[PDB]
Amino acid sequence: IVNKFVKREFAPDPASTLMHELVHVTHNLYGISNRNFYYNFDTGKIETSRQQNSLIFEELLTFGGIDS
């Protein structure tokens, strides 16, 4: 509360960055991953789109939190 923090920009922990991929490893080891549930971010009609790569639903489930 008394930090006098100018900006709340945090750096990730390498332990948690790897511990994300360990969950994907578990999914692969148990025969769980399916790429059919994906968000296709390619929309041309609005013409103002972030133009991002397709995001797998397994990817958000692995990350967890609000998005999952």
Binding site: I1, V2, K4, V6, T43, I46, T48, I66
Partner: protein, 687 residues
């Protein structure tokens, strides 16, 4: 350069907090209007108006893409065919019904995922755009401030303090920006959730209903055959289950929705009040300590004591100049020029028993070195004082501090706007604090009663807490409810009500009259009657109704629990050793006079019931009477009458009429039903 700098902070904080609370029920959008010209959103639908533009189109205006979704054709389900058995074809029917339910839930989840992908992500990028806009507004303000500092022509080599002021001002601007973004997110998330629930599921439900009807047809054809295997009773039960279940709409379960109000409300108090607590001086396990845990260098005098208090033991400053509590100031309690802060504490100030301290203001808690803040107590009035190097504020609470009642005083200091003082959650006065700049001194925060001419004078303190934010009226009243979360019954002072302590009992109406008994030998009944009125004389020569009058009633239980009385507990008042209750026969059909066990001619139903129909913090309680078959349930009240040749008195009666129509009566009649339950407490004494 300080006046302009505080004006900047005040204007930015007040103007980015602008909201418009439209009051459509269950929507109540708190639209911030400045997004209209901040972001070119609602100019197409209604140029120059954004709050009005939201009404015409809740989401269509806010979002750049309404998707107009679609879902596959949803072919109906089927079953297997073979030489089946009854016990397993019944399981087939149950499985088909469960599969239909899971299909409904799955299509709802599919449309929820589509909503999140297409609708919610647009809301998130809108929030990001708003954050960009607000942050660049703040950085433009910072550019102007640092330009102004670059032209400090007035003085030389005095820019360092101005630079620290600008840094703190930028921090304050960032706080205002984050509050504005909290409002923006709060009103956009609700809009998106409403769109999902209202305009998206009903599209799905039509196809889901068609699938459900197809499933019903297939299953009902599956029971016309295999009916002989089932048996007529099992066939009838299965047909009824299929007809009832495969005809309804399965509700969409939104308890797992990403952004929900319940998530934002379950921890409202933790994230808005307790998060900013940097001091909370209380008593735990018989020892005085900082309940927040921020600091531990709090040293207390040898003549400090702990006495019974509002919820747990209370700090009692004996005012003997050795009952000094002092908290060594650390970085948490050091409040700079631009730091808002709030001080909330419970006080119980004894009634002045002798006239030797009037007009002599004596401090209660001071962080003061001829500069700083100071809470003092003059004659029944609490004084809050700020003193800068040249400027000051003195705010005085009206009265009734020295009436021996637990009062929660909370002082909120928004350095930009003003300092407000609330007593018991109700605003007293607000004064401009914009001219006061440095109130920081390194001396410890001192709880002491110095400059007191009375060596026996004391004061009970409880939960003296300091917060690093200015709690507005909503958070102040929320913090005042928090202290009454439990459903305890409060006596007149504000303490919880116990189960083996003798109390004086008086009505809110007719003050000064306590309960006594008289016996009617002709009727053989021991009536409870308000005693003769008496008044007490204050040292300042003002007369007040006496509290220690009549007989002492003893609250009891059917098993002597010896706990604390609660909101709807069943009790047994025992005046002068005789239980109080209403008659249990047809003898007393006139107003149901309340009698005591003295006199065995008539049987009584002793079990009363303390209730608090009004707000939880009131220092009075209603006494609902039991419902026996003879008398209806009523609220213990008093009526003044002369029923027979005996003198004109005030008789206590159950009043079956008040209980039935209680919520329709005005607040003035409710005075008849309230009872105070006066303890004999030090600090209030008529001698």
């Amino acid at each position: 350069f300080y006046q302009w700098l505080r004006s900047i902070v005040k204007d930015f904080s007040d103007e980015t907090g602008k909201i418009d609370v439209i009051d459509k029920s269950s929507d109540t959008l708190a639209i911030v209007p400045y997004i209209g010209p901040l972001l070119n959103i609602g100019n197409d639908i209604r140029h120059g108006d954004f709050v009005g533009a939201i009404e015409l189109a809740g989401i269509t205006a806010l979002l750049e893409y309404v998707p107009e979704f679609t879902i596959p054709i949803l072919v109906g389900l089927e079953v297997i065919g073979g030489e089946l058995a009854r016990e397993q074809v019944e399981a087939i029917v149950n499985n088909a019904l469960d599969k239909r339910d899971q299909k409904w839930a799955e299509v709802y989840n599919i449309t929820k995922a589509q909503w999140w992908g297409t609708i919610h992500l647009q809301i998130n990028t809108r929030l990001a755009h708003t954050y960009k806009a607000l942050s660049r507004q703040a950085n433009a303000i910072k550019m102007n401030m640092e330009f102004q500092l670059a032209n400090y022509k007035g003085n030389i080599d005095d820019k360092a303090k101005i630079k620290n002021a600008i840094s703190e001002t930028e921090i304050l601007l960032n706080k205002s920006v984050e509050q504005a973004m909290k409002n923006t997110e709060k009103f956009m998330i609700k809009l998106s959730n409403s769109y999902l629930t209202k305009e998206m599921i009903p599209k799905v439900q039509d196809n889901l209903k068609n699938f459900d009807l197809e499933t019903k047809k297939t299953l009902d054809k599956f029971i016309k055959e295999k009916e002989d295997i089932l048996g007529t009773n099992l066939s009838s039960s299965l047909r009824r289950k299929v007809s009832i279940r495969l005809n309804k709409n399965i509700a969409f379960d939104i308890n797992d929705i990403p952004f929900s109000e319940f998530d934002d409300l379950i921890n409202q108090y933790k994230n808005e009040i307790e998060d900013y607590e940097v001091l909370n001086l209380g008593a735990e396990d018989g020892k005085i300590k900082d309940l927040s845990g921020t600091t531990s260098d709090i040293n207390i005098g040898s003549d400090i004591e702990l006495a019974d208090g509002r919820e747990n033991k209370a700090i009692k400053i004996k005012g003997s100049e050795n009952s000094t509590i002092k908290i060594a100031m650390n970085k948490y309690l050091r409040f700079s020029a631009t730091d808002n802060f709030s001080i909330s504490f419970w006080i119980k100030h004894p009634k002045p028993t002798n006239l030797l301290n009037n007009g002599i203001e004596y401090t209660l808690v001071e962080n003061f070195n001829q500069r700083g803040w100071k809470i003092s107590i003059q004659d029944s009035k609490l004084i809050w004082y700020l003193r800068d190097h040249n400027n000051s504020i003195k705010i005085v609470t009206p009265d009734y501090i020295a009436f021996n009642g637990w009062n929660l005083i909370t002082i909120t200091n928004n350095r930009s706007k003003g300092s407000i003082v609330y007593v018991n959650g109700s605003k007293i006065e607000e004064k401009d604090i914009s001219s006061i700049w440095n109130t920081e001194v390194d001396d410890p925060i001192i709880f002491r009663l110095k400059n007191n001419r009375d060596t026996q004078a004391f004061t009970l303190l409880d939960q003296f807490s300091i917060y690093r934010k200015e709690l507005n009226q909503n958070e102040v009243v929320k913090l005042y409810n928090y202290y009454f979360n439990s459903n305890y019954i409060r006596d007149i002072w504000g303490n919880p009500l116990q189960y083996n302590k003798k109390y004086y009992l008086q009505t809110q109406d007719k003050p000064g009259k306590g309960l006594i008994r008289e016996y009617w030998s002709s009727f053989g009944y021991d009536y409870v009657i308000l005693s003769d009125s008496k008044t007490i004389t204050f040292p300042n020569n003002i007369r007040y109704g006496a509290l220690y009058n009549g007989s002492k009633v003893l609250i009891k239980n059917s098993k002597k629990l010896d706990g604390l009385v609660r909101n709807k507990d069943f009790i047994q008042l025992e005046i002068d050793g005789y239980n109080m209750g209403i008659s249990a026969d047809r003898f007393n059909e006139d107003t149901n006079y309340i009698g005591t066990t003295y006199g065995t001619t008539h049987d009584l139903t002793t079990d009363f019931e303390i209730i608090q129909r009004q707000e939880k913090y009131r220092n009075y309680c209603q006494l609902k009477t039991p419902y026996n078959i003879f008398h209806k349930s009523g609220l213990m009240s008093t009526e003044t009458s002369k029923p027979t040749f005996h003198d004109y008195r005030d008789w206590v009666y159950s009043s079956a009429w008040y209980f039935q129509n209680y919520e329709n009566l005005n607040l003035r009649k409710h005075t008849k039903t309230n009872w105070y339950f006066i303890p004999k407490d030090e600090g209030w004494d008529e001698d």
